[PDB]
Amino acid sequence: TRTHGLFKRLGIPGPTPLPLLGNVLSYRQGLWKFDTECYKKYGKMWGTYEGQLPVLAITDPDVIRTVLVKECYSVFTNRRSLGPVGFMKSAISLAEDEEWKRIRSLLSPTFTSGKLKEMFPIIAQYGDVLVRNLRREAEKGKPVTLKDIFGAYSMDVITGTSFGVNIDSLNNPQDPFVESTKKFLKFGFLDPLFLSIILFPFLTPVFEALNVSLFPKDTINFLSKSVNRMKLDFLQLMIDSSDLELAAQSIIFIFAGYETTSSVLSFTLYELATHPDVQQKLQKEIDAVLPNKAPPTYDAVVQMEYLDMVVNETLRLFPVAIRLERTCKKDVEINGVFIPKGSMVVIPTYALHHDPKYWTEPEEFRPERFSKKKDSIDPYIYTPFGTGPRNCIGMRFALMNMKLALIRVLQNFSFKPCKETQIPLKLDTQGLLQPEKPIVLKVDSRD
Numbered sequence: 001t002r003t004h005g006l007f008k009r010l011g012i013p014g015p016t017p018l019p020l021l022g023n024v025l026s027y028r029q030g031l032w033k034f035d036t037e038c039y040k041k042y043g044k045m046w047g048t049y050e051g052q053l054p055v056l057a058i059t060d061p062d063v064i065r066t067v068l069v070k071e072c073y074s075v076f077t078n079r080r081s082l083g084p085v086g087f088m089k090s091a092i093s094l095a096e097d098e099e100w101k102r103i104r105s106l107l108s109p110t111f112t113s114g115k116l117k118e119m120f121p122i123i124a125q126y127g128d129v130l131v132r133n134l135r136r137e138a139e140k141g142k143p144v145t146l147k148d149i150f151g152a153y154s155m156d157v158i159t160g161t162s163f164g165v166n167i168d169s170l171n172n173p174q175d176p177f178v179e180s181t182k183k184f185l186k187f188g189f190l191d192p193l194f195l196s197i198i199l200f201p202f203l204t205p206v207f208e209a210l211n212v213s214l215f216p217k218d219t220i221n222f223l224s225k226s227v228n229r230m231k232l233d234f235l236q237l238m239i240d241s242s243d244l245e246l247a248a249q250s251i252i253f254i255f256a257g258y259e260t261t262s263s264v265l266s267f268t269l270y271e272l273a274t275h276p277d278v279q280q281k282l283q284k285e286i287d288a289v290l291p292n293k294a295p296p297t298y299d300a301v302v303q304m305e306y307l308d309m310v311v312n313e314t315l316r317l318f319p320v321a322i323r324l325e326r327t328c329k330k331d332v333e334i335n336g337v338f339i340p341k342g343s344m345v346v347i348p349t350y351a352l353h354h355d356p357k358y359w360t361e362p363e364e365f366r367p368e369r370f371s372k373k374k375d376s377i378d379p380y381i382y383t384p385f386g387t388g389p390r391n392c393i394g395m396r397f398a399l400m401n402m403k404l405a406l407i408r409v410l411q412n413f414s415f416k417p418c419k420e421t422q423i424p425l426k427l428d429t430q431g432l433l434q435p436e437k438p439i440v441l442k443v444d445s446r447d
């Protein structure tokens, strides 16, 4: 209760904390659900405690633009106070202040639209693997469990592009890359370690000194073992430019991009199933641009307007990262409130994405929201990839992979519900947004 008066004192509303734990019990229902309930309850700003760590949640866009862009470098440079990660404290999402400022700089040339335009054929090759895989499953007439197919694609594309070559994960379950990377799936709140770290950060130096890491030590090595072993994609581009630092980044990319890409694709496809009119219209768009199942190309995949709007609206409904988190590296005035050092600020993307103030019929899937014809979207309400210098660096790359996959599958099949399709979709209560029950759809071919 050392800090459990901070918000009472500073005139900031919030749910009453419980000793030691904080409001953390409220997280078991899921953060997206907690973040919104508070939003509705407390308005523009509410405070909570993670054990002892205060947490300030801002919804006003200007305040957001302050935290995310204006004073990203003067104050809010780090995300969540670092945990027992050992040497992956070099990977870019985890580094802080200057160490990150460098690593960011030294990886930017890899994620420019130019290098992406370059990598395009190495990615689109993975769509042929994907189509066979989805035909196999649907040739039968058998409902398809999307997370198998598109989890597989997600990993194949990232593994191969990040380091190595095609694994065809679905048909090589015993591949040593497949079993080892599959272990990022259980990240966040689930592990006892994260809880003890969340509630008692002062143990973090301890676990480091005991070589106990949040990450699966069993796999971190095998990846590093395969990285140094190799020393067309991220690898060589990293090659041209420490050797531990290089080995981290390769792993974080797989981390930051494996499960997000996967959940978003099956989310997109779920919505196309339950709005067949949107599914035709995108099919029409695809067939006019690449007639007779033509091979995709970079400048096409980028200029497909509806397709962009379709991915974009899905990220409105399903911001897989739920919230954006920054740490005050110094005392700071955030919108007339005095916020001590170490504190965390939360920009509640999911809740802001579902606000009726900014989105007519917020629960409805309406790709038209993103018509370039309409008034541009506020980049601090819509924060699916972050904004500011700390945003998803692979943003352009992820949108490419998903669009590539979505095109290939939509050239060859449609998607519709069946008896086993959960409608409405329900979210799970842990980690990145995922469905309560896995998505299964009927996938008939167009011929």
Ligand code: HEM
Binding pocket: 079, 092, 093, 094, 104, 252, 253, 254, 256, 257, 258, 260, 261, 264, 319, 320, 321, 324, 325, 383, 384, 385, 386, 387, 389, 390, 391, 392, 393, 394, 395, 397, 398
């Ligand atoms: C649908 C796919 C993805 C989504 C929704 C997503 C979302 C996000 C978000 C919200 C952040 C943090 C933003 C912030 O702090 O405000 C982030 C960070 C990051 N993402 Fe992604 N991401 C995706 C895919 C990827 C992929 C494929 C990669 C790399 C190949 C990637 C690499 C990274 C990295 C390195 C960071 C941390 C960089 C930093 O802290 O400066 N992301 N991502």
Ligand SMILES: CCC(=O)O[C@]1(C(=O)CCl)[C@@H](C)C[C@H]2[C@@H]3CCC4=CC(=O)C=C[C@]4(C)[C@@]3(F)[C@@H](O)C[C@@]21C
Binding pocket: 031, 080, 093, 094, 187, 188, 189, 255, 256, 257, 260, 320, 321, 322, 323, 324, 325, 430, 431, 432
């Ligand atoms: C998990 C793969 C990944 O790299 O995700 C992150 C990212 O930037 C790219 Cl998505 C990663 C560094 C840490 C991730 C957050 C930790 C706390 C956390 C616990 C949850 O239960 C739900 C969401 C977050 C709040 C989080 F998961 C997401 O925002 C995504 C973050 C920031």
